[PDB]
Amino acid sequence: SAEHVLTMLNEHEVKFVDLRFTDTKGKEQHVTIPAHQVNAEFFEEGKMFDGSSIGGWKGINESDMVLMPDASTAVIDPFFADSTLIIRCDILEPGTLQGYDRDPRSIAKRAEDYLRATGIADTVLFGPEPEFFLFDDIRFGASISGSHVAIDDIEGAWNSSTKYEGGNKGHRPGVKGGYFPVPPVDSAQDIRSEMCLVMEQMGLVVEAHHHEVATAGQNEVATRFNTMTKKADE
């Protein structure tokens, strides 16, 4: 519903609309337009943008493409300072308005279509469990004379010997010893929950959260499955 969107704009006194999409590598991208640029046209014909700018997309001759807002994805950004509404978009070929061969979201939609077409089933269910790390300092580089990477976190077992300004309080998860020691060994309870609350404010449904195995901040937020394309969005 494009009308639901126009009411969310007034209800939250939205000043901007953040148009989002994903590139081939999987990285979410965005561009912003003032809320006042959202009209009837916007939904039926989308907005134009340069294709040649994204890696692995259009080359030298056929740069221009279409950003098609998917009104079902509207959700408020919980971090931006000024009220802004996020709207995920698909990348369509201009004129034909088909769905770019290289647009990963279009590809995923095509795959859900083909599922229904073969008649094998009518919906696919995906429940991915992404894990991640939370650090304090990450440094790296590479040049002709060398290269390096340095990781640092207050939980890192290696910091058992580190001198700290206000003293080393030393309750850290040892190597492979992160699976569930209660705080203070686990330093990320408050943060894992904020992530949960915020994820839900954004439409996700959280099932659980916990510290993972590795020292130095491995963590996990488990979310409820959903239909394939909606889950990738999630």
Binding site: S160, G170, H171, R172, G174, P181, V185
Partner: protein, 234 residues
Amino acid sequence: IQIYKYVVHNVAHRFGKTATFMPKPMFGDNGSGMHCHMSLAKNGTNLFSGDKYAGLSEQALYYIGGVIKHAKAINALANPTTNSYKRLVPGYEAPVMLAYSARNRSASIRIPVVASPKARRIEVRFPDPAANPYLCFAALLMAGLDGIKNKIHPGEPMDKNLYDLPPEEAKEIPQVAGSLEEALNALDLDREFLKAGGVFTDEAIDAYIALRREEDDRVRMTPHPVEFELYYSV
């Protein structure tokens, strides 16, 4: 040995270094051992060469039997420090299995394979450089002699493998003491072979044991850095 240590210590000092004969200064790399090659002789002939195993005399075998019978007590002199036992740990090349062989370097007693019968001898591998020359060598002898006087047969040579796999019959064959206290206690109980000939007196033995128990206590009573890693967050 005393001169040897003196030269090592002082040449090192003169070169701007510092030398140590401690048996295991570092966890994770080789310790320092002091293998002892031994053989007996009379009127210029080597009493250890013969037709038995690997070119040995039956006298050599009784000697070996003696060393094996009194190993734990010899340990109190040949491995007189708590540190000594950080070298003698279930490792692959750890000279801890009380057995002989000309190949199996799991065996604390190697039989050098040499051509000239004039050079036939045994190599007791578990001693470390912290050992008192005098007392260590003496205890090795007395154990050997008691092995002879009482025709203590060695049993058969171990040519299989060390402490790990084996692990078949739980591989509980003879082994050297696993701690200084254990070795001191063995020396306490198994002192007869040393008192033979009035070589070692009870007073001497008891005094030695008392000196080392005081050392053993410092280590047993002082918290170890690793204990913090293991139990601070208990």
